[PDB]
């Protein structure tokens, strides 16, 4: 076939050899006849014939000659497809430069020339001059000159000077540039400077120099004097209705540049002056700029219209931004759109399909069967008999209906379950019947959309489609451990009304012989579906591997639970079906039986459960009526009392006591208090809405109405939706940012007025705006999110390195948010787990966490588990399957060839359409206190003062597991001691977000050093002796003499000896900052730990975009650089120079801090690297400089899971861990010797370079690296490909980068292989790629 898909710069001579002729006339079609002439845009000598096997003159019309040339015309007779093989060329007498290298976001000519874009555009605009080969001159070849300046330079020199202008001078400097020798001066001058703006230009200059060195192409080949022509079969010329034609704009632009080159040819041979050839070369420059692009500086218009013309960029791309024509639209054959409907009488392994489309989607199959059986060997009579609707066409067609797969895809594509595989049957009509239980996996309710079908041609594709997307294979969802086949309201109402605990019925206390005898007794008409009965169960347990013991069990199951175990096979226990059959309950049930039996028994249980649910929904009799919505009599009392309260609020606001904000906050929390009060009252009157009795006066149970059934089941909707139906509707907020204080006094049952509906319509239109914009925003984010993660192939089985990353459950707040078992399900273990005893190992191997290991770790008390993460893998250009968990469609471990990144991005892109203080630390449950990385000192009174703000309060349970985690700031008080008894609801830590105390470490008398009454401190006295202390002055309000003076309260002993803190040589002297008040005077004995002074102190779409882009917010958090002591430097110098002086290694560099951001850094505190200081968030890239990978990754999974948990969906952390590895794949270097100082390359290339340099001649040629983390719009730009990046990025920059690059790229990737249609590496192409690697450059 073909290999070595590279990009190299080409000479004009090889462009001439690729060409087939020169065009010099504007003739496209003749005016007399409809036949083109020679030497034109539609010529036959250069390109070929317009028809099949014919010549231009019409002499040879036969079929035999394929490579013969005629005598009258110089054309070669061939097929009609040879117009799409041959091209032409346009001769340029003066070479014209390429504007794709200039008008992009980089201008590579200005970087290779060390210039800007303005001067290199001005030399093309013929306003300034440029010289080539100056030598012994005042101005070099990189200088600029005007017309008078060039005239004076030519007059003062006379010889050894050549002043040109335009693009021939660019070709001359690119010929005499010496790019193989000019890189040495740049590599010598690169360690001379250490700038940022200059070093960035030097880095891209050495990048293009190394690209020109490794390219093997001359730099003079950028400017071209031979320019090819577009092929005339890609640009249309067809006869329309009425003698008209249909042409593209590329014909017009190519004809225009042809005429301008012809005028250049006719003007160059008359000894023309300089001004008109400057104007004509400028005209050809704008002409070829309009040829390559449109909408920048040309703005050319066409005749009798207002739309601009389409360049060749609109032929390589087309419409819809900078996406290619093969990437914008692809109409695939053997397809067709239809509407779908539900078919409930069909199994999971089959479906329905109407005959009107079944006659055509199986057309090559019916042609092969009709030509093979022996009834009609022709194809035109076959078309006549399938268009005549014969009687035998169904009998000969039904053979490829029963056992032939079909594909069906929704035209709005949301996730990977939108495509499926099924088996058709022969029905009547025009629309398609579908499986009922797959529309939940489709996320496509039957709303009359347009769904298209697909039929692959070969039977191999049918076998692999029944292997990959058949509905008995993709049972598990790629988001979490829940199945994507979700039961809807009818089967769950069947299980709800079937299994029930009733008080009074007919047949209470009766006996049943068996399960099918109970089925006979219920259907007789005298027994109820819900009654307290008694029946034995012939159950079988599959606990032993390979044996199903039979045993009986006497349980108090009803009629409905017996009929529920009638359909449930002998692979499930009888105690698991004793619950109330909620939606999540039966979801966990189907997930459990799937996990314990596999696939086939699950999918044959699924149709039988669906059938009995459909039958028990049909024979049920619930309905939502006017008596279903019970209205309590206390709701009007609550409304009237709150109306009197808001009238009191309005009168006390009109009397002039409080402002608008206080009463606004009062109404917007008291109305929500009344809202959830009437909501729980609605739950009460919906739960107690049943009056039954059996041989008694009264008996209370669950209600027997459909609203309570759908509230307890929870199929579609929640408990907050019935408040709008029955009780108070809620508090819709205004879209401007405020809330409306007037409530909804009526409801949907009684009837709303105009005003409450006007409040509700604003929130309704706001929700419609969110649901309209969220689909477009989710598509716009996922079009880059899966685009960066399309290089996550699997090609290695088991590397052998030992790494990993700790996974902690979400224990933020009072209780745990996310459990431990909901995060490590399906994962693999990295190392051996450590029991809290001594030398106790569960398993010393990386086994898969199955459905037994989760309750095995739940019975244990381990919480700090380390899984094998792919973010610390050792493989090159991929991810091994041993790191990836079992979070896939199958139940076993993943294998080699799975594209794990696209499902990882699709699990984030799927629920993107469903989206929209610290005063006291109190515990929720009784647990022991566990100190984790906190330095605290005991006080004399008994309290515990913590001086480390990196410490966290971990509430460990009675077994030893952490169920609650809290954050402890600096200067907090810990009333409870470590290693004590548990207490529920008690206060363990207390800190003021208001004042900020300054605890001390030593005792003795204090002495203020450097305090001036008027410059540093000021004796401030409040009214009526309210405050008598020493008030410090501000840094800006102080005088010029006391501006650099800083007070420091020196702590010494009472006898006069110098007291110093242990650990450091300096004494424990506390400084006096601004806006502080000293409680104790100088010269008094102060204890350790006392307060010395008092110092006062969005979400959804854009939040997930900001955390995926890895970019800084509008207000970032600044952290201290090195762990150790944090001191203050410059104060009134313009910025905050927070210096860092550690004990182990001191660094002279200090990070800067702006004056606008608030700095919570204490002077002299031991601020580590993990301590946050400034308010607001810290980006992942920013964090990636102090700590490393593990704390960053746990912060990323926490800040993903806290916003993804409130919606309702559950996503495992691997789906963002693999894309975090992909955007962490590129790193940077900070040391020369083998590469430059600043360069960004992959970490695998640096690893194999270090492995090659460690074993060789020198000792250590390589050096260390530095990890930098990227976002989704610049991690995919550091790839070694060109056409994978020519789909989302602009082609005008990436094609020029590939042209100057010269990197001989291979077929590594997925977009390079799906842009052409060759063998894909990810998947079943491993054998083909191994055969290609064996037969290519190997024995």
């Amino acid at each position: 076939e073909f290999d070595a898909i590279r990009i190299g710069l080409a000479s004009p001579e090889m462009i001439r050899s690729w060409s087939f002729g020169e065009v010099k006339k504007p003739e496209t079609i003749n005016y007399r006849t409809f036949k083109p002439e020679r030497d034109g845009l539609f010529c036959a000598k250069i390109f070929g014939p317009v028809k099949d096997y014919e010549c231009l003159c019409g002499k040879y019309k036969r079929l035999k000659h394929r490579g013969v040339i005629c005598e009258k015309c110089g054309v070669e007779v061939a097929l009609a497809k040879v117009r799409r093989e041959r091209m032409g060329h346009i001769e340029l007498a003066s070479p014209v430069a390429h504007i794709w290298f200039l008008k992009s976001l980089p201008s590579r000519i200005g970087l290779l020339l060390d210039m800007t874009l303005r001067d290199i555009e001005r030399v093309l605009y013929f306003e300034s001059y440029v010289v080539i080969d100056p030598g012994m001159t005042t101005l070099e070849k990189g200088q600029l000159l005007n017309d008078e300046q060039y005239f004076e330079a030519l007059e003062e020199f006379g010889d050894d000077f050549d002043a040109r202008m335009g693009a021939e001078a660019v070709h001359e400097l690119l010929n005499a540039i010496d790019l193989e020798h000019e890189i040495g001066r740049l590599r010598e001058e690169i360690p001379q400077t250490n700038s940022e703006t200059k070093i960035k230009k030097l880095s891209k200059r050495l990048k293009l120099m190394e690209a020109f060195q490794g390219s093997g192409n001359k730099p003079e080949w950028m400017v071209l004097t031979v320019l090819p022509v577009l092929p005339p079969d890609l640009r249309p010329l067809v006869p329309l209705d009425g003698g008209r034609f249909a042409t593209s704009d590329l014909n017009d632009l190519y004809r225009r540049v042809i005429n301008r080159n012809n005028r250049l040819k006719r003007l160059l041979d008359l000894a023309a002056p300089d001004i008109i050839v400057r104007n004509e070369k400028r005209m050809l420059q704008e002409a070829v700029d309009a040829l390559l692009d449109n909408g920048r500086r040309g703005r050319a218009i066409t005749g009798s219209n207002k739309r601009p013309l389409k360049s060749l960029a609109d032929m390589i791309k087309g419409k819809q931004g900078r996406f290619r024509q093969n990437l914008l639209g692809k109409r695939v054959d053997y397809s067709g759109r239809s509407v779908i409907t539900v078919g409930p009488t069909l199994r999971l392994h089959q479906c329905g399909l109407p005959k009107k489309m079944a006659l055509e989607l199986f057309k090559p199959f019916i042609f092969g069967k009709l030509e093979g059986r022996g009834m009609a060997t022709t194809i035109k009579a076959a078309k006549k008999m399938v268009e005549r609707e014969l009687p035998e066409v169904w009998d000969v067609l039904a053979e490829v209906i029963r056992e032939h797969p079909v594909l069906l895809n929704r035209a709005p594509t949301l996730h990977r379950l939108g495509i499926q595989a099924f088996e058709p049957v022969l029905i009547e009509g025009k629309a398609i019947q579908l499986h009922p239980l797959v529309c939940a996996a489709y996320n496509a309710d039957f709303d009359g959309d347009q769904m298209a079908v697909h039929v692959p041609l070969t039977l191999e594709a049918q076998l692999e489609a029944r292997a990959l997307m058949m509905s008995t294979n993709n049972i598990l969802s790629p988001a979490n451990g829940e199945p994507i086949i979700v039961p809807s309201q009818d089967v769950v109402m069947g299980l709800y009304y079937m299994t029930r605990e009733a008080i009074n019925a007919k047949g209470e206390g009766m006996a049943f012989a068996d399960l099918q005898e109970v089925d006979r007794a219920y259907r007789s008409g005298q027994a109820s579906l819900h009654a307290r009965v008694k029946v034995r169960i012939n159950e079988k347990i599959k606990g032993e591997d390979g044996q199903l013991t039979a045993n009986t069990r006497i349980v108090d199951t009803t009629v409905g639970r017996a009929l529920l175990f009638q359909v449930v096979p002998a692979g499930l226990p009888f105690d698991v079906v004793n619950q109330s059959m909620k939606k999540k309950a039966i979801s966990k049930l189907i997930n459990h039986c799937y996990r314990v039996v596999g696939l086939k028994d699950t999918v044959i249980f699924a149709d039988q459960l669906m059938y009995t649910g459909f039958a028990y929904s049909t024979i049920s009799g619930v309905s939502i009526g006017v008596n279903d919505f019970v209205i309590p009599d206390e709701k009007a009392r609550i409304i009237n009392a709150a109306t009197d309260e808001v009238k009191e609020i309005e009168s006390q606001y009109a009397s002039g006591l409080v402002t608008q904000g206080e009463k606004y906050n009062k109404v917007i929390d008291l109305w929500s208090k009344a809202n959830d009060e009437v909501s729980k009252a609605m739950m009460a009157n919906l739960s107690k809405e049943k009056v039954v009795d059996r041989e008694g006066k009264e008996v209370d149970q669950e209600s027997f109405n459909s609203m309570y059934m759908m509230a307890d089941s929870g199929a579609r909707g929640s408990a907050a939706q019935i408040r709008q139906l029955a009780g108070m509707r809620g508090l819709m907020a205004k879209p401007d940012g405020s809330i409306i204080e007037t409530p909804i006094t009526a409801n949907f049952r009684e009837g709303l007025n105009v005003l409450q509906y006007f409040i509700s319509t604003h929130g309704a239109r706001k929700g419609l705006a969110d649901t309209a914009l969220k689909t477009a925003n989710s598509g716009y984010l996922t079009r880059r999110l899966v685009d960066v993660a399309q290089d996550l192939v699997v090609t290695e089985i088991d590397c052998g390195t030992e790494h990993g990353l700790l996974m902690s459950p979400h224990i933020e707040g009072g209780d745990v948010v996310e459990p431990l078992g909901e995060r490590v399900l399906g994962r693999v273990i990295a190392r051996d787990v450590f029991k809290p005893g001594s030398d106790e190992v569960i398993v010393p191997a990386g086994t898969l966490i199955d459905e037994k290991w989760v309750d095995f770790l739940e019975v244990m008390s381990v919480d700090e588990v380390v899984v094998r993460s792919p973010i610390t893998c050792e493989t090159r250009h991929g991810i091994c399957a041993m790191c990836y968990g079992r979070d896939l469609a199958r139940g076993h471990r993943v294998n080699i060839g799975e594209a794990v990144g696209v499902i990882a991005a699709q699990s984030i892109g799927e629920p993107g359409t469903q989206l929209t203080a610290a005063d006291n630390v109190q515990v929720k449950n009784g647990g022991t206190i566990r100190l984790h990385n906190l330095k605290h000192v005991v006080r004399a009174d008994g309290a515990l003062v913590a001086v480390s703000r990196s410490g966290e309060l971990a509430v460990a349970d009675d077994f030893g597991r952490e169920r609650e985690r809290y954050k402890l700031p600096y200067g907090a008080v810990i009333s409870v001691k470590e290693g004590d008894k548990v207490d529920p609801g008690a206060i363990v830590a207390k800190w003021d977000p208001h004042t900020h105390p300054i605890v001390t470490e030593v005792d003795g008398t204090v002495a203020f050093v450097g305090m001036e009454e008027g410059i540093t401190v000021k004796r401030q006295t409040d009214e009526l002796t309210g405050l008598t202390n020493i008030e410090v002055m501000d840094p800006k309000d102080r005088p010029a003499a006391g501006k650099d003076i800083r007070p420091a309260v020196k702590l010494i002993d009472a006898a006069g000896k110098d007291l110093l803190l242990p650990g450091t040589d300096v004494p424990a002297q506390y400084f006096l900052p601004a806006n502080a008040l000293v409680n104790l005077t100088d010269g008094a004995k102060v204890s350790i730990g006392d307060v010395v002074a008092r110092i006062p102190q969005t979400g959804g779409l854009p939040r997930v975009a900001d955390l995926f882009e890895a970019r800084r917010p509008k207000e970032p958090s600044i952290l201290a650089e090195i762990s150790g002591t944090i001191s203050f430097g410059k104060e009134t110098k313009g910025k905050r120079r927070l210096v860092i002086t550690p004990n182990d290694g001191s660094d002279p560099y200090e990070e800067l801090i702006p004056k606008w951001r608030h700095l919570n850094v204490f002077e002299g505190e031991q601020v580590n690297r993990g301590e946050v200081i400034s308010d607001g968030p810290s980006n992942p890239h920013d964090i990636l400089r102090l700590l490393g990978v593990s704390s960053l990754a746990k912060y990323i999974v926490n800040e993903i899971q806290d916003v993804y948990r409130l919606q309702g969906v559950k996503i495992n952390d691997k789906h963002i861990e693999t894309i975090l590895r992909q955007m962490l794949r590129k790193v940077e270097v900070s040391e020369s010797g083998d590469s430059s100082f600043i360069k960004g390359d992959q970490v695998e290339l640096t690893q194999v370079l270090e492995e090659n340099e460690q074993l060789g001649t020198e000792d250590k040629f390589p050096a260390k690296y530095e990890r930098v983390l990227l976002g989704i719009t610049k991690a995919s730009l550091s790839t070694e490909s060109f056409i994978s990046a020519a789909s989302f990025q602009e082609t005008t920059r990436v094609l020029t980068e590939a042209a100057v690059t010269g990197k001989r790229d291979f077929l590594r990737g997925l977009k390079e292989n799906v842009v052409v249609g060759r063998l894909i590496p990810a998947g079943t192409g491993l054998a083909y790629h191994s055969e290609r690697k064996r037969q290519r450059d190997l024995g």
């Binding site: 639209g329 057309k363 090559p364 030509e371 292997a467 294998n895 060759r1318 079943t1324």
Partner: protein, 96 residues
Amino acid sequence: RSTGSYSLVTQQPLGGKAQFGGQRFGEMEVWALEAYGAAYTLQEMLTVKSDDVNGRTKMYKNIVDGDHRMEAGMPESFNVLIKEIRSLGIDIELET
């Protein structure tokens, strides 16, 4: 539509021959197709159903005759790409 007349810039079917075309097999469709670990249908739907010259002919002959060989061949999408890239004068060669 089972078989439709191909386009002029590439070998992709379209309307105009008294038959409506198919749906758009764009980026998200092939992304959901390679969501599973497969590789053969991804190239089969890209070189057999569209973007070929003699591959559809030899595959139809293999369907009619019955025997299957699954020859790789050379698609025309690479030819359209190499012509549109060599229109800018770019050296592309094969090592082999």
